[PDB]
Amino acid sequence: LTACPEESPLLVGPMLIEFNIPVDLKLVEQQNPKVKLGGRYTPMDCISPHKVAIIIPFRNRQEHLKYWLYYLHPILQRQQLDYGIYVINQAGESMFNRAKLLNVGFKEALKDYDYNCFVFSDVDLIPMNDHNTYRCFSQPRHISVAMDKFGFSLPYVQYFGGVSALSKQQFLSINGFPNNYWGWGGEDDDIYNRLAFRGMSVSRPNAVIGKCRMIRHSRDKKNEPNPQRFDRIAHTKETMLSDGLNSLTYMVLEVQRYPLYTKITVDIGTPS
Amino acid sequence: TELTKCKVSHAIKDIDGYQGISLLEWACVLFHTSGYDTQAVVNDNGSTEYGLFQISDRFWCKSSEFPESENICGISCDKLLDDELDDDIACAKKILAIKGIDYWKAYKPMCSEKLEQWRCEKP
Numbered sequence: 184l185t186a187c188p189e190e191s192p193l194l195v196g197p198m199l200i201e202f203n204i205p206v207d208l209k210l211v212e213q214q215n216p217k218v219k220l221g222g223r224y225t226p227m228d229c230i231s232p233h234k235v236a237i238i239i240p241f242r243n244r245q246e247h248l249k250y251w252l253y254y255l256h257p258i259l260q261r262q263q264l265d266y267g268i269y270v271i272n273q274a275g276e277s278m279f280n281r282a283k284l285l286n287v288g289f290k291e292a293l294k295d296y297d298y299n300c301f302v303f304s305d306v307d308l309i310p311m312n313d314h315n316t317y318r319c320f321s322q323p324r325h326i327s328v329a330m331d332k333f334g335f336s337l338p339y340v341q342y343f344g345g346v347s348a349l350s351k352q353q354f355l356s357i358n359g360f361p362n363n364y365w366g367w368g369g370e371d372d373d374i375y376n377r378l379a380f381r382g383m384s385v386s387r388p389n390a391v392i393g394k395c396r397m398i399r400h401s402r403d404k405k406n407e408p409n410p411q412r413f414d415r416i417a418h419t420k421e422t423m424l425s426d427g428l429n430s431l432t433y434m435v436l437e438v439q440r441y442p443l444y445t446k447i448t449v450d451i452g453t454p455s
Numbered sequence: 456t457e458l459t460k461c462k463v464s465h466a467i468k469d470i471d472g473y474q475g476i477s478l479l480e481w482a483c484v485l486f487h488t489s490g491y492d493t494q495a496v497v498n499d500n501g502s503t504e505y506g507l508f509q510i511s512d513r514f515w516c517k518s519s520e521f522p523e524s525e526n527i528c529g530i531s532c533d534k535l536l537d538d539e540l541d542d543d544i545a546c547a548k549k550i551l552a553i554k555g556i557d558y559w560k561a562y563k564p565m566c567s568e569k570l571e572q573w574r575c576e577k578p
């Protein structure tokens with residue numbers, strides 16, 4: 184009944200991450216018997232102050248999700264987090280909208296439990312060191328700091344894509360994420376801007392414990408580079424007041440509870 | 456061909472300073488423009504942008520599907536998809552002289568500050 188230590192005694196540090204040997208979700212449920220229906224886990228040893236909803240923007244990436252679940256589930260437990268896994272599956276075939284799904288993940292996960300922390304994670308990013316905690320900090324946290332994709336370097340100091348974490352309040356303070364970014368790129372830069380325009384700075388683990396692997400993959404159809412991103416990014420200051428949580432509309436088509444996660448299929452509209 | 460900051464920086468030397476843009480700014484603009492990929496191809500509004508610089512076939516190069524284009528740079532767009540940057544650079548130079556750095560939309564919003572991070576730190 185005593186709180187979990189600040190740093191988990193279960194940590195292993197650097198880890199081997201590879202995507203060659205096929206995974207069997209059944210074998211994963213097997214290895215992770217503590218994860219309950221829906222992909223919920225709560226430490227029974229101590230009391231974590233980190234009630235974390237991990238939100239994954241999704242559409243046709245089940246193979247990546249397999250690896251994600253396999254690697255992350257053991258890690259999140261090692262980190263003694265009271266967590267929930269949410270896969271926000273974009274229904275349909277129109278342009279992919281990453282940030283909007285993230286917004287949905289926020290509202291949907293809140294329907295389940297009183298989470299105070301939100302980790303937005305893409306499906307293809309695996310942390311290579313368990314010291315890179317998936318929780319919230321005194322400032323918005325950028326987690327996928329050093330991706331093999333970028334030579335294990337932050338590509339630019341203003342970068343906020345991949346995996347990040349905002350407390351409920353930090354998130355609420357910026358009207359959440361934007362819903363108007365259709366297609367690839369820029370939404371993460373917009374989110375970055377939103378933080379600065381609200382007095383928040385970015386917190387990050389250093390480049391060594393922040394090492395991360397992104398499963399190699401090609402850009403998906405219906406998620407082409409958004410030709411407008413650069414212009415939309417220049418107006419974040421004004422648009423963030425009218426495009427975000429407060430302007431979110433979506434319809435839930437299906438809520439699925441598997442043993443290792445909760446997948447929610449939603450209709451989020453079209454680029455208009 | 457996915458290049459790197461330093462590779463880009465060394466292959467791009469001849470353009471440094473032209474129209475007042477430094478190598479720090481180009482490294483920044485090019486990362487956001489094509490992720491340094493010389494074979495980057497992207498659609499916009501019924502037109503295509505080619506290579507490291509994302510030169511458009513609308514007015515700058517000739518693409519088989521746009522024999523009408525002004526082809527201001529006088530080159531086939533496919534020549535901007537190989538790994539020889541000489542012609543890409545000369546074309547980029549013309550765009551700078553004519554339309555200016557604002558052709559690259561990532562410049563203002565992404566490369567207006569914090570340029571030191573874009574320097575190549577390898578000899």
Ligand SMILES: O=c1ccn([C@@H]2O[C@H](COP(=O)(O)OP(=O)(O)O[C@H]3O[C@H](CO)[C@@H](O)[C@H](O)[C@H]3O)[C@@H](O)[C@H]2O)c(=O)[nH]1
Binds near residue numbers: 244307345367402
């Ligand atoms: O058809 C699709 C397209 C995207 N996604 C999800 O969207 C994320 C991003 O798409 P992807 O092509 O993998 O993005 P990247 O270009 O590889 O990744 C980085 O760059 C984007 C641009 O900076 C970001 O915003 C991402 O957050 C960041 O991790 C994916 O990881 C998935 O979680 C799907 O599930 N299905």
Ligand SMILES: O=c1ccn([C@@H]2O[C@H](COP(=O)(O)OP(=O)(O)O)[C@@H](O)[C@H]2O)c(=O)[nH]1
Binds near residue numbers: 212245442446
């Ligand atoms: O904890 C889990 C989650 C998933 N699955 C398996 O993974 C499949 C899910 O496929 P997908 O998400 O593509 O299903 P769809 O949403 O398209 O019904 C299930 O049917 C199971 O066979 C499993 O065995 N354990």
Ligand SMILES: [Ca+2]
Binds near residue numbers: 534535536537538541
């Ligand atoms: Ca060339």
Ligand SMILES: [Mn+2]
Binds near residue numbers: 305307397400
């Ligand atoms: Mn990716």
